[PDB]
Amino acid sequence: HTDLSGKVFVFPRESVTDHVNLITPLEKPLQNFTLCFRAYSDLSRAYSLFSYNTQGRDNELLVYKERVGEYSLYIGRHKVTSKVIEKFPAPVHICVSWESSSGIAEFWINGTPLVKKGLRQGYFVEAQPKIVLGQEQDSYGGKFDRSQSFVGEIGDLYMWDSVLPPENILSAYQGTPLPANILDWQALNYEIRGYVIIKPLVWV
Amino acid sequence: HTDLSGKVFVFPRESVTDHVNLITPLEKPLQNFTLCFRAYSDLSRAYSLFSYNTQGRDNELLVYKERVGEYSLYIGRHKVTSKVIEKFPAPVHICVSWESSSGIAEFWINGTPLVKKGLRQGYFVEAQPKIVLGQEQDSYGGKFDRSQSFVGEIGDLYMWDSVLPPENILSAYQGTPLPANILDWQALNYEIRGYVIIKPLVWV
Amino acid sequence: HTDLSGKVFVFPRESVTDHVNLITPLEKPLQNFTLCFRAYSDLSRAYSLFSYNTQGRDNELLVYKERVGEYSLYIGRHKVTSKVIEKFPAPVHICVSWESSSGIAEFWINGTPLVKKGLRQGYFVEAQPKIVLGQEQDSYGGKFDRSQSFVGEIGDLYMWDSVLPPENILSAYQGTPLPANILDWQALNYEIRGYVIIKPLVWV
Amino acid sequence: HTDLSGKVFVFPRESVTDHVNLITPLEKPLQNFTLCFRAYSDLSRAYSLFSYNTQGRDNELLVYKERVGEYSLYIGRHKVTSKVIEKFPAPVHICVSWESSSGIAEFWINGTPLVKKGLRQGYFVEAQPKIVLGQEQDSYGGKFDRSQSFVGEIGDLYMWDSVLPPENILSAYQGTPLPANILDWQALNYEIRGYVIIKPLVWV
Amino acid sequence: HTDLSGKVFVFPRESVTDHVNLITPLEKPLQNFTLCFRAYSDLSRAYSLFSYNTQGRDNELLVYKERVGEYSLYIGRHKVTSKVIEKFPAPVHICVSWESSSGIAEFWINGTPLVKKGLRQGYFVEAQPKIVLGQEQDSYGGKFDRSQSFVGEIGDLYMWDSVLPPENILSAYQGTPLPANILDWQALNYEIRGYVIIKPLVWV
Ligand SMILES: *[C@@H]1O[C@@H](CO)[C@@H](O)[C@@H](O)[C@@H]1NC(C)=O
Ligand SMILES: *[C@@H]1O[C@@H](CO)[C@@H](O)[C@@H](O)[C@@H]1NC(C)=O
Ligand SMILES: *[C@@H]1O[C@@H](CO)[C@@H](O)[C@@H](O)[C@@H]1NC(C)=O
Ligand SMILES: *[C@H]1O[C@@H](CO)[C@@H](O)[C@@H](O)[C@@H]1NC(C)=O
Numbered sequence A, B, C, D, E: 001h002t003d004l005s006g007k008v009f010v011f012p013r014e015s016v017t018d019h020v021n022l023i024t025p026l027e028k029p030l031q032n033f034t035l036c037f038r039a040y041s042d043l044s045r046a047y048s049l050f051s052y053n054t055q056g057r058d059n060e061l062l063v064y065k066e067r068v069g070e071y072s073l074y075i076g077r078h079k080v081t082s083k084v085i086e087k088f089p090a091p092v093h094i095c096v097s098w099e100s101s102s103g104i105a106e107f108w109i110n111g112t113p114l115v116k117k118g119l120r121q122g123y124f125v126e127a128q129p130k131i132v133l134g135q136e137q138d139s140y141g142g143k144f145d146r147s148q149s150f151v152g153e154i155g156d157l158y159m160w161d162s163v164l165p166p167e168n169i170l171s172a173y174q175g176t177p178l179p180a181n182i183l184d185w186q187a188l189n190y191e192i193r194g195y196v197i198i199k200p201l202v203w204v
């Protein structure tokens, strides 16, 4: 509903209040997905990048940054973590995909593939989520934790109900994502809560 | 007023005495500003780069270097800090802007944007400042602190009453800044106190 | 058998179970061999890359990574280790050859030769192995150890009953290996046990 | 008196005895000077590069290296130090100038300007010096200290009674120095004492 | 008597037994020499590269590597050491010359000159040596020490009875050495003892 092309959400301070709710009419459990976005933060502590909870289910789909050079994906509370060489601080483009049939999770950082890991083969990610940027949920939509808050900037966020092949991940990294059907930065339905400011993306 | 094109102020030693007063007929409170300048220092300790105090108000607008790789902006005593990868020692070009309506502070270091932070949304920076280079003020024009003194060289200082877009920041970095209406290096009204020497800029 | 051109085995989690059995029909003791393969793992702990045991004989031919930058070859329980400068994590191409007549072991890492070492001169590597990827054997086909399990991806595996000269090693590294007579990725007889997934090779 | 083009003094060992006296008919106190030379040493401890003392005055003009990356100039016992990024060990080209009227000292290391510092504004460096390479003087011509001795090679030394502008500094660095009126490598009047060997310059 | 062009000695293991004796027609004491060779080792501990002892005289001419980045030359039991920036592990080309008349020792590492040092000015290196690769002699031909043994590969060894100019050093480094009258890799008289294997040089 809003085209955020060329813009970012700025989470300008540490808080337990500041967040964006992302709204998607996701009625069917997810068997496959890819999520891509850009982020720029100079936090050294742990923080959540993308928090997806469902009723009665915490950490149903969570992209979490434990520390520099380490990215984690949670699926139904279980997690995998893969490492990468990265500068700090530095803008980053992140893609992560997961496929129920194999359980394989693929992280791509700045268009470079990390080591594949695997979890929750056969599982379906539950539907009707609450999806939050800026805070890590411990409840269905809430129970945030200041020490897990994201401070910095996020943009170019897209989510597909399939596993993107390498050349489509590269297209997203280059700023030309293929059509996305779960979340789309160019037609995004969202709710700002607390202190979140929309600004031009100046670091790509 | 003096055209300091191609020249720098040299603060050649640590002291509590040496400083430059910058004079501007600033009568109305500031809602928006951008400040750019070049500096070269081999201090490892903390130091003030640009100190702006008003009657009864400390750190009304302060650009302060905590340590290598970390830049702070104070607005009305409140502070934000953002990090960057930089060599040490090394000449640097710094721009910082702040916008009351959003509270957003943007640092640019050698033409590269740091992570945005936010403070004092809705605040107006007071007018009738005393503006000092070389020392950090704790009073209106004084109460300096040797351990916060700037030792080294500063040049190409410009201050605008608006937030510069990236193209204008890069122009400043490259040595062709837009005309500036609060402070302008090519028409600077200043007072040297103590040991400050004007020399050609040899390090750009 | 199976042509795995353009594919890898993914060992997506640490376990004492997940492995691939590799079957060679060439049944003879080995006086000379070369083994080449690609691997991508972000483990920092020790792990087995290629485990070849015979009846009643542990570590008959073993390629083992004790830590970053250090590759070990075991021949008949004796071991040599050579060091290399490598980024971590990073995909790697590994070739190792051994020649009974001299005892010389040559490791090549990304087409660069490591320092030669020597062991078991005059020895013959025993015939009729169980050859395992993903786990380190302590028995004939079993007695695995989760703390030595391989997590990550292996592809482009070839094994010859001769010592390859540098030009052939470079050919393998570049993706044009000479056909191999003990094990060949383009005609591989394998058995997956437990959680191992075949995926496209996306990192080379 | 001697043309040392393409040659260095080699101080091949640590001692309290080995040195070179440089003779100049300098009768007028110095208001301005520049000194350039090349050096190559693998000492990590402190050492004197150029020691100029006058009767009753220690450290009248001294260029001293306290540790890697730090160069000091003394004028009349007072000192300033500036820092630089440098590899170790590595050959270096050093220029330093000082100007009484401003007190400004400029170090240039491999043609790169260090941060300016200032000392002894208004002072005149005393004439009738004893000038020593290889040792640091604490008396007029003597009282050396082996813990301050220079072990290594020095060449292409020039001293002018003016402050060289950047173009002339770069010319010296690139091997086209302006002829010099206090000390000049093409016509150097020197006395070797102890173990000092003249050899071709093979490193720069 | 053997042309070892394109080949190396491989010392494939740590031992107190494995060594090569080099045989030269040298009855006259040495006043000048240059020694060049190429080596590739991943030892971190100290080791001997070239050990030349005479009757009743230990360390008469010894090239020894105490630790990464540091090369030592002994002449008649006296030693000098010079430092260099180098990668580890990495193939290296080493030349060292010594001149009795000046005492000057020149090390060149990968065609780069180290800081000159000086020792034993006026001394004559004794004749009738036993020359050993692979072990450090403490007696005339023996008393080896496993903790000083060279493990790895040595090739392209030449020794001249003169001090080579830089152009000739660079020629050796580049693979076109001048003919050498004390030891010549292309016409070498040697004795292998213990486990030493001749292999092609694959790392140049
Ligand atoms: C998702 O995964 C693929 C297999 O790669 C298909 O099995 C697909 O049907 C899966 N599920 C869907 C589209 O819902
Ligand atoms: C400053 O900020 C902008 C908003 O982009 C404007 O609101 C501008 O009017 C503001 N204030 C002034 C005095 O120019
Ligand atoms: C192995 O090594 C080759 C060449 O080095 C031959 O010597 C070969 O006979 C060796 N042994 C074999 C093939 O059994
Ligand atoms: C010396 O230094 C120069 C600056 O380059 C001038 O200031 C000059 O007047 C100074 N004084 C003398 C004696 O030459």
Ligand SMILES: *[C@H]1O[C@@H](CO)[C@@H](O)[C@@H](O)[C@@H]1NC(C)=O
Binding pocket: E031, E032, E099, E101, E161
């Ligand atoms: C070295 O020593 C003797 C014997 O070779 C002379 O030849 C001498 O000239 C040599 N070289 C020099 C410069 O001393």
Ligand SMILES: [Ca+2]
Binding pocket: A058, A059, A136, A137, A138, A139
């Ligand atoms: Ca949670």
Ligand SMILES: [Ca+2]
Binding pocket: A136, A137, A138, A144, A145, A148
């Ligand atoms: Ca939480």
Ligand SMILES: [Ca+2]
Binding pocket: B058, B059, B136, B137, B138, B139
């Ligand atoms: Ca203050």
Ligand SMILES: [Ca+2]
Binding pocket: B136, B137, B138, B144, B145, B148
């Ligand atoms: Ca203060």
Ligand SMILES: [Ca+2]
Binding pocket: C058, C059, C136, C137, C138, C139
């Ligand atoms: Ca085993």
Ligand SMILES: [Ca+2]
Binding pocket: C136, C137, C138, C144, C145, C148
């Ligand atoms: Ca085991």
Ligand SMILES: [Ca+2]
Binding pocket: D058, D059, D136, D137, D138, D139
């Ligand atoms: Ca002194």
Ligand SMILES: [Ca+2]
Binding pocket: D136, D137, D138, D144, D145, D148
């Ligand atoms: Ca002294």
Ligand SMILES: [Ca+2]
Binding pocket: E058, E059, E136, E137, E138, E139
């Ligand atoms: Ca010895």
Ligand SMILES: [Ca+2]
Binding pocket: E136, E137, E138, E144, E145, E148
């Ligand atoms: Ca010994």
